[PDB]
Ligand binder design. Structure first.
Ligand SMILES: Nc1nc2c(c(CN[C@H]3C=C[C@H](O)[C@@H]3O)cn2[C@@H]2O[C@H](COP(=O)(O)O)[C@@H](O)[C@H]2O)c(=O)[nH]1
Length: 315
């Protein structure tokens, strides 16, 4: 466990007061999923950009640099190619739209200088993308780090990882401040690395596990601790919430980042996915943790009306 995600999150799950795993539900869900050999959907080619290897690598870094927090009222929505999108697909569509119209979002020099008005345009739609100013700041940071340390080419970073997913995550968090996703729980560091790990899985997807998307150790990735997958796990009965936390989610009350409740959700998400992975493998359906994450995130796109709302964090 070379990044320390499973180890540090396990300490949280063992001590967690507001969240816990129902291991019976894990078994039952594993039974049904294994029975019908459920598979994550293939990496989406419609709403993701495609290009030569240098531009594509840079595109994946930018996509995942700003891959966070899409909730808020009035709901942020995007119109692209005769369809309306929200959440992640709104992000994806927005970038694809910008690149098609020839915005140089894969060029480090442009990213280093990108303005608030640039990103407001790129993500123009109904409402406004949350944390707009932050996204502008992250893209400027991303650009100037690319330019300074990687000759403007994320492919330089990828090459230095030598086909290790774990090594690339560590290269990314070392160089790019925005990707440093750790917190504390009762005085101990907890390590998550959501966006850094999702980046690696997205290279694998975009490059079909060849060239720059070749990795020999993808099993070492964890789930990407977000707000949608815990909502799915709660829906499937795998995550249970204590009274005050349940009521907070129901009221759509925001939870401060790094607070005990929030850290417990994220840790239990990691271990909820890991426990489902082990239970599936037990029943002869071997998937990597990132695949179980993909599969659950996909289920999260068509949850029934009146499932408990996902938790709302911000920072
Ligand atoms: N754990 C996990 N979290 C994911 C993703 C994705 C998209 N990945 C694509 C690439 C390969 C897969 O097959 C997917 O097609 C976005 N997110 C996070 O979810 C939230 C937005 O959710 P919603 O409102 O539904 O759009 C937000 O925190 C966002 O950062 C997934 O991979 N796993």
């Amino acid at each position: 466990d070379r990044l320390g995600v499973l180890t540090t999150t396990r300490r949280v799950v063992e001590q967690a007061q507001a969240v816990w795993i129902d291991h019976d539900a894990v078994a039952q869900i594993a039974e049904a999923f294994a029975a019908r050999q459920v598979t994550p959907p293939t990496w989406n080619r419609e709403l993701h950009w495609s290009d030569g290897r240098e531009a594509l690598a840079n595109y994946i870094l930018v996509l995942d640099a700003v891959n966070f927090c899409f909730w808020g009222e009035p709901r942020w929505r995007i119109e692209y190619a005769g369809a309306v999108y929200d959440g992640y697909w709104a992000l994806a569509a927005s970038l694809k739209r910008a690149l098609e119209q020839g915005v140089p979002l894969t060029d480090a020099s442009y990213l280093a200088e990108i303005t608030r008005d640039d990103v407001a345009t790129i993500f123009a739609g109904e409402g406004e993308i949350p944390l707009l100013d932050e996204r502008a700041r992250i893209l400027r940071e991303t650009g100037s780090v690319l330019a300074e340390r990687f000759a403007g080419r994320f492919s330089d970073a990828i090459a230095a990882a030598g086909r290790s997913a774990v090594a690339l995550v560590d290269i990314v968090t070392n160089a790019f401040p925005s990707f440093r996703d750790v917190a504390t729980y009762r005085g101990e560091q907890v390590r998550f690395y959501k966006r850094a790990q999702i980046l690696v899985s997205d290279l694998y997807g975009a490059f079909d596990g060849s060239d720059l998307g070749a990795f020999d150790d993808l099993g070492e990735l964890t789930a990407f601790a977000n707000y949608k997958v815990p909502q799915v796990l709660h829906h499937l009965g795998i995550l249970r919430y204590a009274p005050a936390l349940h009521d907070r989610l129901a009221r759509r009350e925001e939870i401060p980042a790094g607070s005990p409740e929030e850290v417990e959700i994220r840790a239990a998400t990691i271990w909820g996915v890991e426990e489902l992975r082990r239970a599936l493998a037990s029943r002869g359906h071997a998937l990597d943790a990132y695949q179980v994450d993909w599969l659950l995130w996909d289920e999260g796109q068509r949850l029934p009306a009146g499932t408990l709302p996902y938790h709302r964090t911000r920072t």
